[PDB]
C-alpha cells in the first residue's frame, strides 16, 4: 500500500529551524530575503494552495513534454513557415525572441526564493518553479531552432537578450527589475502574483486562441502547456501576500503589486498589443487586445486581487484609459521604426482592418487613422523616404519604450519629467515617474538608448551605427513591412 500525500505532506515542509552558529539575519539577509523583519516562526503559517510532490511532478511533467514534442514532430510538414500570413510569422519571431531567454532568467527569480524565502512551503514550490522555468526556456529555444535554417530573424530567439536592441533592453530592464534584481519576497509578489497570475495569460493563452484560429497548433499547444506550469508556480504569491497583510505589511505589499502591474502593462502593450490588433490576420483575431485585457486582467486578475484583500491600484482610471490608447501608438512606432526590430511588423491598416479597429475602438480613424492616412498616401505614391525614420524617438527612462500620446483630431501627449541628482529624466506616464521615485537607487544611473546616443556611446551617430550597436549582423535581420507594402493595393 502507499500512503496519500495529505498524510505526509507536512513533513516535506517541516524544514525551518532556529539558527545557532550564524544569526537568522545572516542566514536570511533582508537584501536577498525581503522578510521585512517578520520572524521565522510567522513564516511557518505560509500554505501554498497548489501543491505537488517530487514523484508526481516528474511523472506529470514527463507527460506534458511528450505531448508538446509529439505534436511539433507530427506537424513539421504542415508548412506554417511558408503558408502562414507573414504577420503570423512575425508574431512567432517576436514571441520567441522576447520570451525564451527571459523564461530562463525566471529560473533565477525562483532560485532566489528557494534559497532566501523564510517560508518552507515557498522554498519547495520555488524548487518546482525553478524546474518549470528551465522547461519553458528550453522549449522556447528548441521550438524556433528548426527555423534558423529558414530565416536569420529566428536567431533572435537566442540572441535578443544578448543584444542592445531597443525591445531587448525594455524586456531586460523589466525582468531584471521584477525577477532577478530584488529580494525573494519582492519576487513572490511582483513575479509570481502580479506578473504570472495577471499578465502572462494574455501572451500564453490569449495569443494561443489567435494561434488556434490561425491554424498553428504546434504553437498554440506549446504555449498553453507552458501556462499549465505557470498556473501552479504562480500560486506562490497569494500566500506571501496574505502573510504580509497579517503581519502589518499591507502598505509595502500594495506598493509592490501596484509597481509590478504597471511595469508589466507597458511591456505587454508593446509586444502583445500590436500582435493582437494588427499582426494577427483579421480573420484570426479571436478578440481584440482590449477585449482580452477585460477578460484576463480586469475580470479575472483584478477580481482575484480584491478577493485577497488588496485594493485597486491608485492609477486604475489611468490604466483603463491606457488600454483604449497606448498600444495603437506603440504599434505605430514599432512599425515606423521597423528597421530596429528583429521581426517584420505588419501595418494592419487595410480598409477592412480599419473598419474592425473603428468597431473595437470607436474614434480610431480620427486619431491614429490620421497618421496612417499620411503613411498610406506616401506608400501609394512611392515616397518611401517618408516611411523610414531619420531621427530617434524620445524614450521613457522607466519602460525603455518611446514617449507617445494620442494623435489626430484630439491630439494630446504628455511627458512626465524629473530632475534627480543633477540629471533630467523623462517618463511616459505619471505612474512610471512614480515607480522611479519609489526606488531611485534601482534606476538612477541607468541610461536608456537615447541617453547613450547623446553620450557618444553609439558610434557612428547614424541609423546604421544605431543598428550595429543594437546587434544586427546582416541586412536580412532588420525589420521590414511584413507584406512588403502589398497592403496598400487594398487602399
Amino acid at each position: 500500500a502507499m500512503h496519500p500525500r495529505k498524510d505526509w505532506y507536512e513533513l516535506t515542509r517541516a524544514t525551518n529551524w532556529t539558527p545557532s552558529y550564524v544569526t537568522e539575519e545572516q542566514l536570511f539577509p533582508e537584501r536577498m530575503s525581503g522578510h521585512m523583519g517578520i520572524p521565522l516562526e510567522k513564516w511557518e503559517s505560509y500554505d501554498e494552495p497548489y501543491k505537488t510532490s517530487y514523484p508526481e511532478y516528474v511523472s506529470i511533467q514527463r507527460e506534458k513534454d511528450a505531448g508538446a514534442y509529439s505534436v511539433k514532430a507530427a506537424l513539421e510538414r504542415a508548412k506554417i513557415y511558408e503558408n502562414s500570413d507573414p504577420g503570423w510569422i512575425s508574431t512567432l519571431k517576436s514571441h520567441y525572441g522576447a520570451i525564451a531567454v527571459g523564461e530562463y532568467a525566471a529560473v533565477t527569480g525562483e532560485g532566489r526564493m528557494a534559497r532566501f524565502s523564510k517560508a518552507p512551503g515557498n522554498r519547495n514550490m520555488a524548487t518546482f518553479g525553478m524546474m518549470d522555468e528551465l522547461r519553458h526556456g528550453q522549449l522556447q529555444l528548441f521550438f524556433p531552432h528548426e527555423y534558423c535554417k529558414k530565416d536569420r530573424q529566428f536567431d533572435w530567439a537566442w540572441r535578443a537578450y544578448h543584444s542592445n536592441e531597443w525591445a531587448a533592453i525594455a524586456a531586460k530592464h523589466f525582468f531584471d527589475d521584477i525577477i532577478t534584481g530584488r529580494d525573494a519576497i519582492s519576487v513572490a509578489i511582483m513575479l509570481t502574483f502580479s506578473f504570472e497570475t495577471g499578465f502572462t495569460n494574455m501572451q500564453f493563452l490569449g495569443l494561443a486562441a489567435d494561434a488556434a484560429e490561425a491554424g498553428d497548433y504546434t504553437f498554440a499547444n506549446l504555449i498553453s502547456s507552458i501556462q499549465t506550469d505557470e498556473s501552479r508556480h504562480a500560486q506562490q504569491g497569494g500566500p506571501a501576500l496574505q502573510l504580509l497583510i497579517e503581519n502589518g505589511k499591507r502598505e509595502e505589499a500594495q506598493k509592490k503589486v501596484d509597481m509590478a502591474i504597471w511595469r508589466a502593462w507597458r511591456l505587454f502593450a508593446v509586444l502583445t498589443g500590436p500582435v493582437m490588433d494588427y499582426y494577427t490576420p483579421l480573420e484570426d483575431r479571436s478578440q481584440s487586445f482590449k477585449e482580452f485585457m477585460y477578460e484576463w486582467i480586469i475580470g479575472q486578475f483584478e477580481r482575484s486581487l480584491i478577493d485577497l484583500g488588496l485594493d485597486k491600484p491608485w492609477y486604475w482610471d489611468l490604466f483603463l484609459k491606457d488600454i483604449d490608447e497606448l498600444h495603437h501608438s506603440y504599434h505605430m512606432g514599432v512599425w515606423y521604426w521597423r528597421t530596429t526590430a528583429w521581426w517584420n511588423p505588419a501595418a494592419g491598416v487595410t480598409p477592412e482592418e480599419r473598419d474592425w479597429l473603428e468597431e473595437k475602438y470607436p474614434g480610431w480613424n480620427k486619431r491614429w487613422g490620421r497618421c496612417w492616412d499620411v503613411i498610406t498616401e506616401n506608400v501609394l505614391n512611392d515616397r518611401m523616404d517618408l516611411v523610414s525614420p531619420e531621427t530617434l524617438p524620445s524614450v521613457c527612462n522607466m519602460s525603455q519604450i518611446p514617449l507617445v500620446g494620442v494623435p489626430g483630431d484630439d491630439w494630446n501627449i504628455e511627458v512626465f519629467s524629473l530632475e534627480h541628482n543633477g540629471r533630467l529624466y523623462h517618463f511616459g506616464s505619471e505612474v512610471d515617474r512614480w515607480v522611479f521615485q519609489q526606488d531611485p537607487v534601482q534606476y538612477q544611473n541607468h541610461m536608456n538608448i537615447v541617453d547613450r546616443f547623446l553620450a557618444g556611446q553609439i558610434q557612428p551617430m547614424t541609423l546604421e551605427g544605431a543598428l550595429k550597436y543594437m546587434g544586427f549582423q546582416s541586412i536580412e535581420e532588420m525589420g521590414k513591412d511584413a507584406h512588403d507594402f502589398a497592403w496598400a493595393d487594398k487602399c
Partner: protein, 102 residues
C-alpha cells in the same frame, strides 16, 4: 469604466482548460458536481473558460466517469491552463471559490 466596473464586479470561478481531451469531460463534470448552479462556457478554441457563481467543484470520481478512463486528480494539471477563483485541491476534488461577494 461603466464597462470596467461591470467586468470587475463578477463572482465567476472555474477552470480554464486548454484544447484537448479534457474540455468536454470537465464541462460535463462541472454540470454534474454543481447541481443547481448554472455553468457558463466560453469557447476560445485554444482554451475554454468554464465558470459558476461563487464556487465550482470538480470531483475526481465524476471526472473519471466523464473522461472514460482511470484518472488521478493531480493529472488535471496537464490541461488546467488557468483558473478563476482561489483554489483548494486534494486527491478527491478541486474547489474554485471566492472569499468575497462582489
Amino acid at each position: 469604466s461603466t464597462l470596467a466596473d461591470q467586468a470587475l464586479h463578477n463572482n465567476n470561478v472555474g477552470p480554464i482548460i486548454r484544447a484537448g481531451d479534457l474540455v468536454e469531460p470537465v464541462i460535463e463534470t462541472a454540470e454534474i458536481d454543481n447541481p443547481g448552479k448554472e455553468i457558463t462556457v466560453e469557447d476560445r478554441r485554444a482554451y475554454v473558460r468554464i465558470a459558476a457563481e461563487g464556487e465550482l467543484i470538480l470531483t475526481r470520481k465524476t471526472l473519471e466517469e466523464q473522461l472514460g478512463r482511470p484518472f488521478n486528480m493531480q493529472e488535471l494539471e496537464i490541461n488546467l491552463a488557468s483558473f478563476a477563483g482561489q483554489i483548494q485541491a486534494d486527491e478527491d476534488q478541486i474547489r474554485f471559490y471566492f472569499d468575497k461577494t462582489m
